[PDB]
Design a protein around this ligand. Sequence first.
Ligand SMILES: *[C@@H]1O[C@H](CO)[C@@H](O[C@@H]2O[C@H](CO)[C@@H](O)[C@H](O)[C@H]2NC(C)=O)[C@H](O)[C@H]1NC(C)=O
Ligand SMILES: *[C@@H]1O[C@H](CO)[C@@H](O[C@@H]2O[C@H](CO)[C@@H](O)[C@H](O)[C@H]2NC(C)=O)[C@H](O)[C@H]1NC(C)=O
Ligand SMILES: *[C@@H]1O[C@H](CO)[C@@H](O)[C@H](O)[C@H]1NC(C)=O
Ligand SMILES: *[C@@H]1O[C@H](CO)[C@@H](O)[C@H](O)[C@H]1NC(C)=O
Ligand SMILES: *[C@@H]1O[C@H](CO)[C@@H](O)[C@H](O)[C@H]1NC(C)=O
Lengths: 87, 106, 7, 49
Amino acid sequence: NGLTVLPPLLTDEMIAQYTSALLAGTITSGWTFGAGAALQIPFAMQMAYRFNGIGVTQNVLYENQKLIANQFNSAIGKIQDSLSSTA
Amino acid sequence: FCGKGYHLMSFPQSAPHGVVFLHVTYVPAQEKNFTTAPAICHDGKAHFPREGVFVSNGTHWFVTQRNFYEPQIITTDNTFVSGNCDVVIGIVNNTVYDPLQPELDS
Amino acid sequence: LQPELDS
Amino acid sequence: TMSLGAENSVAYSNNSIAIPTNFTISVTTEILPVSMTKTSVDCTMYICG
Ligand SMILES: *[C@@H]1O[C@H](CO)[C@@H](O[C@@H]2O[C@H](CO)[C@@H](O)[C@H](O)[C@H]2NC(C)=O)[C@H](O)[C@H]1NC(C)=O
Ligand SMILES: *[C@@H]1O[C@H](CO)[C@@H](O[C@@H]2O[C@H](CO)[C@@H](O)[C@H](O)[C@H]2NC(C)=O)[C@H](O)[C@H]1NC(C)=O
Ligand SMILES: *[C@@H]1O[C@H](CO)[C@@H](O)[C@H](O)[C@H]1NC(C)=O
Ligand SMILES: *[C@@H]1O[C@H](CO)[C@@H](O)[C@H](O)[C@H]1NC(C)=O
Ligand SMILES: *[C@@H]1O[C@H](CO)[C@@H](O)[C@H](O)[C@H]1NC(C)=O
């Protein structure tokens, strides 16, 4: 041909390790892994901070935690179907 | 956006064909592990921190701001109430002190 | 405060 | 093979929190280009000399 396509520096398995590291930090330690060393916190209390940041008082999370967890798990489930149904 | 860590301020300096920013930032350090709880049961009612978090050194419960360890005695003006003990997952049993209590010695 | 200082 | 970084497992559990007891102020450099070299070309002088 005279034309050549070159590989990327990072393979898809290296990209998948970065998306894993970002996600595992976010779940276990909030924003703190961006601002310094990762500091662990329980995920219900991380979500209490996320709620308190939008001006909804944090007792609203703990008093509704099962409902909030079910709405989240259901909303994640619909993404699988929405991606599976059409290109 | 304005350098890694929490942003305090920055200073501009000129350079040929460009600009340089000296971003001053606060980075937290020397962390310790603590036991923690989302709420506290006093007289049948759930107390939540007004700002900061509940933590324990293993024997005592304190409230502290969340970006620098500065433990305080837990009180009715460090905390706010919402509802009975039975709803909150992971609530713990501790006294919450009332600053008016010794003034009732009047 | 007023009901508490009623004591 | 290049290394992405040190491996770490964060010590997460449903009742553990880590709180910082100290800090460091950190001053960081950032650099951006803002302007090119301004140029003009006389195309009659370049092409026809
Ligand atoms: C948790 O913190 C409290 C307050 O710093 C500690 O309680 C003090 O303990 C000393 C003995 O080590 C006593 O002399 C003080 O009278 C106690 N103060 C109070 C207000 O009770 C407690 O020892 C700490 N526990 C741990 C495991 O570090
Ligand atoms: C927090 O304290 C309350 C009492 O102030 C505990 O409630 C009692 O628990 C026992 C079993 O351990 C039951 O038989 C009683 O009927 C309960 N009493 C009341 C008034 O509800 C409660 O279990 C404590 N919570 C923890 C996590 O220790
Ligand atoms: C916190 O405790 C865990 C064990 O429970 C330990 O592996 C970890 O190194 C501790 N972290 C700090 C910052 O002390
Ligand atoms: C936390 O996990 C332990 C087991 O590791 C369990 O016994 C306890 O009931 C859990 N508490 C909460 C508030 O989830
Ligand atoms: C905090 O860190 C500085 C060095 O950055 C050190 O000199 C100081 O003694 C530390 N203070 C505590 C209480 O650890």
